[model samples]
Target: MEHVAFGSEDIENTLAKMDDGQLDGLAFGAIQLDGDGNILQYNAAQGDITGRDPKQVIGKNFFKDVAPCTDSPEFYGKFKEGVASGNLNTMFEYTFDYQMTPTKVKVHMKKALSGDSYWVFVKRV
Candidate 1:
């Protein structure tokens, strides 16, 4: 597979074709969530970046159980809006400070092209 940059256009389609191994190999973090915010996939880079083991977070609620700080309008709200509209392609800069030191990252959220899963891509900035 070719290198897929963090800001690649129509990334959802490309992501749909990747397996867990490919996802884990990415330089940036890749998180796959269900429609209701449940985490379905958490890649290795994400675990390294956030210092959380993917094994522990795989079945948890991303906003409520994993990252409560993002439950606000800026993050979780955007996710809800996207799920509601079926058009979840959006990107922004965010700081992760709930459980660790301030870590800034560029986040891209989008609905998968062929499944009910939603993806959140995080690249440290």
Candidate 2:
């Protein structure tokens, strides 16, 4: 098993090297989203934790539809800031609704300097 230091400078490349499904164990639940909050990948752990079928989530607008609770100044705001700034990497704590229950989580985001893509990482605490 490999572990990624959440904010390590190489985190992007590190994750890119793994098979998509591999993100599950690296955090409480892992998701990769586009600049517009569209989910590209949602791992099995997230499926089990949220009681959501990954198939139902993939291709959905995460902030707008899936996690509307995060469409605030704290979560989605930072995402927009990072994208608008052309680089994004930040970590914060927030409450997420998992399986209809409020759960605590550590959130991490990273976008390339090009602002072409980004990732959202989450760990339940």
Could you say which candidate leads in lDDT?
1
Error of 1 at 16 (Å): 1.4
Off by over 4 Å in 2: 112-115
Return the top candidate by TM-score: 1
What do the candidate models score in CA lDDT, each in turn? Answer: 0.89, 0.77
List the lowest-lDDT window of 10 residues for candidate 1: 1-10
Compose the digit string of candidate 1's lDDT tens values, residues 76-118.
9999999998878889999999889999999999888876789
Q: Alpha carbon lDDT of residue 75, candidate 2?
A: 89
- lDDT value, candidate 1, whole model: 0.89
Question: For model 2, how many clashes?
Answer: 0
Report the poorest 10 consecutive residues by lDDT, candidate 2.
112-121
Clashing pairs in 2: none
